[PDB]
Design an enzyme around this catalytic site. Structure first.
Site, PDB file in Angstrom:
ATOM      1  CG  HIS A  78      -4.692   7.124  -2.397  1.00  0.00           C
ATOM      2  ND1 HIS A  78      -4.700   8.541  -1.773  1.00  0.00           N
ATOM      3  CD2 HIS A  78      -3.829   6.752  -2.477  1.00  0.00           C
ATOM      4  CE1 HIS A  78      -3.341   8.358  -1.515  1.00  0.00           C
ATOM      5  NE2 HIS A  78      -2.927   7.722  -2.368  1.00  0.00           N
TER       6      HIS A  78
ATOM      7  CG  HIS B  66      -2.363  -0.794  -3.079  1.00  0.00           C
ATOM      8  ND1 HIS B  66      -1.812  -0.978  -4.729  1.00  0.00           N
ATOM      9  CD2 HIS B  66      -1.689  -0.014  -2.591  1.00  0.00           C
ATOM     10  CE1 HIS B  66      -1.988  -0.095  -4.814  1.00  0.00           C
ATOM     11  NE2 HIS B  66      -1.603   0.578  -3.781  1.00  0.00           N
TER      12      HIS B  66
END
Ligand SMILES: O=C(O)/C=C/c1ccc2c(=O)[nH]c(Cc3cc(Cl)ccc3NCc3cccc(F)c3)nc2c1
Ligand SMILES: [Mg+2]
Ligand SMILES: [Zn+2]
Length: 292
Positions: free
Chosen positions: A77, A117
């Protein structure tokens, strides 16, 4: 200022040269600056720089602000995952011909959402530090950067366009919560099964945008086998060693989450088949390893 100076002064190679139209695109051989250049090219070939009068140094500063607010110490991530998610959105709009089904404001919001996001993600095993809590934090980081001095790439929009685009940006980021995908996918699938899917309906259009964000979010599962093996390595690093069972975990993730989604996406646009195709070939490879 050094990175901004170099990026603003660079020439942006074409979309064909940068290979960002390919569903099989990968980023392992690219520097940070090269990913920033591909991102500029994404905004350019979607006519977003034109139709909304973005100034070059503001977009460069915005891209560098978004990249800076991802954490390098997080295995998966991170910025490269956000960059890849945006690339898949580009490929789905162009090579997948989804562009013609959406408005300019929707396209503008999806590209910003895909890049933003996961902002300020600190790893799945660092959830404590702080209804989709993380996705609300991600949107908040996105809005702050959009409002920062020198970074306001939406200044050229009217107040009506701006309010509309932020609403779509927020829902698109919120859709990247797997819980929301699991909740709403049954309605999406049932509409396609009954041959009743219509995007002119506002409620169904928002639902399709939610599913499209999830398809780009997880699109690493569709990559060619050598790339997927490496991405699965990053996922396993973040899950276990940060804060073999991998083959069967990849098969279960593909069965429970991915296959239906990329099938539904193919029914909506047959040119998105390489995503379903690549996802199937990866299930074949992972299952064989699981069986040994
Ligand atoms: O959220 C995003 O932006 C995208 C989400 C995403 C993308 C790709 C995969 C994938 O290819 N596989 C698995 C399954 C898995 C395997 C293994 Cl070996 C270990 C854990 C898991 N899933 C849990 C998990 C832990 C840490 C990081 C992570 F992303 C997912 N889930 C994925 C989840
Ligand atoms: Mg996320
Ligand atoms: Zn993500």
């Amino acid at each position: 200022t050094r990175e901004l100076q170099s990026l603003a002064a660079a020439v942006v190679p074409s979309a064909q040269t940068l290979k960002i139209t390919d569903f099989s695109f990968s980023d392992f051989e690219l520097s940070d600056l090269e990913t920033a250049l591909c991102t500029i090219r994404m905004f350019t070939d979607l006519n977003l720089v034109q139709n909304f009068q973005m100034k070059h140094e503001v977009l460069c500063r915005w891209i560098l602000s978004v990249k800076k607010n991802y954490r390098k110490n997080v295995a998966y991530h991170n910025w490269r995952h956000a960059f890849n998610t945006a690339q898949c959105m580009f490929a789905a709009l162009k090579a997948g011909k989804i562009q013609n089904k959406l408005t300019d404001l929707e396209i503008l919001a999806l590209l910003i959402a895909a890049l933003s996001h996961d902002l300020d993600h600190r790893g799945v095993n660092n959830s404590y530090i702080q209804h989709s809590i993380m996705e609300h934090h991600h949107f908040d980081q996105c809005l702050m950067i959009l409002n920062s001095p020198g970074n306001q790439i939406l200044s050229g929009l009217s107040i009506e366009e701006y309010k509309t685009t932020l609403k779509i940006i927020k829902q698109a980021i919120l859709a990247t919560d797997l819980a929301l995908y699991i909740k709403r996918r049954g309605e999406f699938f049932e509409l396609i099964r009954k041959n009743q899917f219509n995007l002119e309906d506002p409620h169904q259009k928002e639902l399709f945008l939610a599913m499209l964000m999830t398809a780009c979010d997880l699109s690493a599962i569709t990559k060619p086998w050598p790339i997927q093996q490496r991405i699965a390595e990053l996922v396993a690093t973040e899950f276990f060693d940060q804060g073999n069972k991998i083959p069967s975990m990849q098969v279960g993730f593909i069965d429970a989450i991915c296959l239906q989604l990329y099938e539904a996406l193919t029914h909506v646009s047959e040119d998105c088949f390489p995503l379903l195709d690549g996802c199937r070939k990866n299930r074949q490879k992972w299952q064989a390893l699981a069986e040994q």
